[PDB]
Each structure stands twice: as C-alpha cells, then as structure tokens.
Design an enzyme around this catalytic site. Structure first.
Site, PDB file in Angstrom:
ATOM      1  N   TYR A 196       0.829  -1.194   0.000  1.00 37.30           N
ATOM      2  CA  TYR A 196       0.000   0.000   0.000  1.00 37.30           C
ATOM      3  C   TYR A 196       0.869   1.252   0.000  1.00 37.30           C
ATOM      4  O   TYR A 196       2.062   1.215   0.311  1.00 37.30           O
ATOM      5  CB  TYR A 196      -0.958   0.017   1.197  1.00 37.30           C
ATOM      6  CG  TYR A 196      -0.314   0.195   2.558  1.00 37.30           C
ATOM      7  CD1 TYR A 196       0.146  -0.899   3.280  1.00 37.30           C
ATOM      8  CD2 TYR A 196      -0.211   1.457   3.145  1.00 37.30           C
ATOM      9  CE1 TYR A 196       0.717  -0.738   4.531  1.00 37.30           C
ATOM     10  CE2 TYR A 196       0.365   1.625   4.386  1.00 37.30           C
ATOM     11  CZ  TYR A 196       0.826   0.524   5.077  1.00 37.30           C
ATOM     12  OH  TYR A 196       1.394   0.689   6.320  1.00 37.30           O
ATOM     13  N   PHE A 228       1.219  10.149   3.671  1.00 35.86           N
ATOM     14  CA  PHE A 228       1.180   9.999   5.118  1.00 35.86           C
ATOM     15  C   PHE A 228       1.560   8.607   5.593  1.00 35.86           C
ATOM     16  O   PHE A 228       1.821   8.442   6.788  1.00 35.86           O
ATOM     17  CB  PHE A 228      -0.213  10.366   5.663  1.00 35.86           C
ATOM     18  CG  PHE A 228      -1.326   9.487   5.156  1.00 35.86           C
ATOM     19  CD1 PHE A 228      -1.967   9.779   3.961  1.00 35.86           C
ATOM     20  CD2 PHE A 228      -1.763   8.394   5.896  1.00 35.86           C
ATOM     21  CE1 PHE A 228      -2.992   8.981   3.495  1.00 35.86           C
ATOM     22  CE2 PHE A 228      -2.789   7.592   5.436  1.00 35.86           C
ATOM     23  CZ  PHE A 228      -3.405   7.888   4.235  1.00 35.86           C
ATOM     24  N   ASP A 229       1.603   7.607   4.714  1.00 36.73           N
ATOM     25  CA  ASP A 229       1.920   6.243   5.107  1.00 36.73           C
ATOM     26  C   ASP A 229       2.396   5.495   3.871  1.00 36.73           C
ATOM     27  O   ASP A 229       1.960   5.781   2.753  1.00 36.73           O
ATOM     28  CB  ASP A 229       0.707   5.540   5.729  1.00 36.73           C
ATOM     29  CG  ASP A 229       1.076   4.268   6.473  1.00 36.73           C
ATOM     30  OD1 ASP A 229       2.277   3.928   6.540  1.00 36.73           O
ATOM     31  OD2 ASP A 229       0.157   3.599   6.989  1.00 36.73           O
ATOM     32  N   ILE A 260      -9.297   0.128   7.903  1.00 34.44           N
ATOM     33  CA  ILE A 260     -10.428   1.032   7.719  1.00 34.44           C
ATOM     34  C   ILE A 260     -11.381   0.484   6.663  1.00 34.44           C
ATOM     35  O   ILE A 260     -11.019  -0.403   5.881  1.00 34.44           O
ATOM     36  CB  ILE A 260      -9.933   2.436   7.334  1.00 34.44           C
ATOM     37  CG1 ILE A 260      -9.119   2.345   6.045  1.00 34.44           C
ATOM     38  CG2 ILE A 260      -9.100   3.030   8.456  1.00 34.44           C
ATOM     39  CD1 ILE A 260      -8.737   3.667   5.448  1.00 34.44           C
ATOM     40  N   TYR A 301     -11.882   8.383   8.470  1.00 37.31           N
ATOM     41  CA  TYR A 301     -11.543   9.257   9.588  1.00 37.31           C
ATOM     42  C   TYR A 301     -12.284  10.589   9.594  1.00 37.31           C
ATOM     43  O   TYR A 301     -11.972  11.424  10.451  1.00 37.31           O
ATOM     44  CB  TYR A 301     -10.030   9.548   9.614  1.00 37.31           C
ATOM     45  CG  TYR A 301      -9.152   8.364   9.959  1.00 37.31           C
ATOM     46  CD1 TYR A 301      -8.965   7.969  11.279  1.00 37.31           C
ATOM     47  CD2 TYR A 301      -8.505   7.644   8.961  1.00 37.31           C
ATOM     48  CE1 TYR A 301      -8.160   6.885  11.596  1.00 37.31           C
ATOM     49  CE2 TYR A 301      -7.699   6.560   9.266  1.00 37.31           C
ATOM     50  CZ  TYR A 301      -7.530   6.186  10.582  1.00 37.31           C
ATOM     51  OH  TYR A 301      -6.728   5.109  10.884  1.00 37.31           O
ATOM     52  N   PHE A 358      -5.065   6.154  -2.135  1.00 30.81           N
ATOM     53  CA  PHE A 358      -4.156   5.042  -1.896  1.00 30.81           C
ATOM     54  C   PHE A 358      -3.702   4.406  -3.197  1.00 30.81           C
ATOM     55  O   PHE A 358      -4.500   4.218  -4.121  1.00 30.81           O
ATOM     56  CB  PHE A 358      -4.802   3.976  -1.023  1.00 30.81           C
ATOM     57  CG  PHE A 358      -5.052   4.422   0.374  1.00 30.81           C
ATOM     58  CD1 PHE A 358      -4.022   4.443   1.298  1.00 30.81           C
ATOM     59  CD2 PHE A 358      -6.316   4.825   0.766  1.00 30.81           C
ATOM     60  CE1 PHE A 358      -4.247   4.857   2.593  1.00 30.81           C
ATOM     61  CE2 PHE A 358      -6.551   5.237   2.059  1.00 30.81           C
ATOM     62  CZ  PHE A 358      -5.515   5.256   2.975  1.00 30.81           C
TER      63      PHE A 358
END
Length: 107
Positions: free
Chosen positions: A26, A36-37, A56, A82, A99
């Site tokens: 991912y 962010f990730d 999520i 979120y 993503f």
C-alpha cells in the site's frame, strides 16, 4: 464509497475471501496533500487478513474488489475512514484519502 482505478496487469480471478491472510504494497496519499503512510518505506509489506475489521472500511472494501498482481488506486470517502474523527496529528477531520494499492498476496 470505494472507487477502483486498476493499472491493468494481474490475473483478475484470484479474489480475496474470508479468513485469507493477504499481502499488500500500500501507499497512502492525501488529496491536495502529500503522503502519510507507505509500506514501501518499511519494506515489510503488511500481512493482514480479511474479515476482522482490522483496516479502515474504505481500504477493506477495495481489497475484496482486486485480484493477484493488480494495481488499483483507492479514493476513500471521509465517513468510512476518519472524516468524523481524524487520526490525531496524522489525519485531520473531513479528509478524503488516496491510496496506491497492489495486491501481491498469498492464500
């Protein structure tokens, strides 16, 4: 709402089912924002299973709508991940998430 934009190659038949532990490269992205990730940074490609609400809801529904080798592109709505809460310091409230998701899994 989960919107799938698959970069074509893969098989199109090996679909994730319940109780199957799957491996995903991912890559997180903020809409009108930076990353962010990323599993590419840690290079541990995030072994997880299907059917336990671990991830999520936007990433969970897009996982079942892919196959082995495919390279999709998520667009997660705020309400499923979120947008009410916001992950503190990392995700603001009312955030639409992007993503880069590739399904190179097992089982």
């Amino acid at each position: 709402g989960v919107e799938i934009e698959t970069i074509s190659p893969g098989d199109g038949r090996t679909f994730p089912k319940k109780g199957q532990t799957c491996v995903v490269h991912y890559t997180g992205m903020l809409q009108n924002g930076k990353k962010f990730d990323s599993s590419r940074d840690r290079n541990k490609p995030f072994k997880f299973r299907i059917g336990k609400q671990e991830v999520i809801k936007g990433f969970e529904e897009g996982a079942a709508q892919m196959s082995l080798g495919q390279r999709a592109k998520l667009t997660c709505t705020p309400d499923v991940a979120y947008g009410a809460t916001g992950h503190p310091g990392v995700i603001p409230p009312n955030a639409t998430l992007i993503f880069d998701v590739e399904l190179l899994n097992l089982e």
